[PDB]
């Protein structure tokens, strides 16, 4: 209901496909060696790459550029982790052939990640598959995660919501025409928002586990995660 939602819906979403991962990168998941070193390198190559397109996407969100600039940073540094997660779940659940699902998983398991963090991560990776989310549901959820006023180091959180709320209502509108036999779908998607938080907690520890054993990052990643 209300295209004025669709003036931004479709608009949200040629932003979403506008860039995929370069296959100079994604075809290294196959062409290169399988060591905990190379495993970690590719993941870095891919997360860093994914930060770049993420920024591009975020900038094209209605009213984001209009925001305080001390918050535009805070929005990204807290949600980048979780946004990465969403876009790879998409990759694994739909089992997209450009993401190389079955192989990408194994690079991750031997990347020096504690099995303590490995496990709940694929508990999710599956968990989000059965929802069989549409791209609009993967896209809107990604924009909503970015536009999250509950992150840390935000001064004007009210303005952030003034831009999240439409896309929420657009999302809310969506789960009543695609799937109507169950009204409770819209707030099962919203539960994944909280699981990602639970993972954003675990991830900061994966980071230190890595930085501890000498695993290094890009200046971009080292900056978005300090």
């Amino acid at each position: 209901l209300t295209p004025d939602q669709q003036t931004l819906l479709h608009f949200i979403m040629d932003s979403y496909n506008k860039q995929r991962m370069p296959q100079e990168i994604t075809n290294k998941i196959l062409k290169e060696e399988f060591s905990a070193e190379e495993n970690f390198l590719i993941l870095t190559e891919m997360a860093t790459n994914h930060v770049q397109v993420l920024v591009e996407f975020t900038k094209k969100l209605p009213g984001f550029q209009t925001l305080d600039h001390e918050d535009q940073i805070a929005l990204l540094k807290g949600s980048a982790v979780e946004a990465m997660f969403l876009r790879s779940a998409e990759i694994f659940n739909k089992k997209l052939p450009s993401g190389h699902s079955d192989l990408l998983e194994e690079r991750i398991r031997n990347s020096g990640i504690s099995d303590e963090y490995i496990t709940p991560m694929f508990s999710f990776y599956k968990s989000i598959g059965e929802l069989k989310m549409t791209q609009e549901e993967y896209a809107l959820l990604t924009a909503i995660v970015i536009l999250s006023p509950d992150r840390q180091y935000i001064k004007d959180r009210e303005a952030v919501e003034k831009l999240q709320e439409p896309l929420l209502d657009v999302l809310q509108k969506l789960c009543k025409i695609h799937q109507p036999e169950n009204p409770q779908h819209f707030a099962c998607l919203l539960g994944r928002l909280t699981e990602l938080r639970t993972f954003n907690h675990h991830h900061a520890e994966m980071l230190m586990s890595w930085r501890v054993n000498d695993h290094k990052f890009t200046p971009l990643l080292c900056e978005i995660w300090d």
Binding site: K59, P219, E223
Partner: peptide, 11 residues
């Protein structure tokens, strides 16, 4: 501090 991020938002 946090200036690599600002160059991607102004492109």
């Amino acid at each position: 501090e946090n200036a690599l991020l600002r160059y991607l938002l102004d492109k």
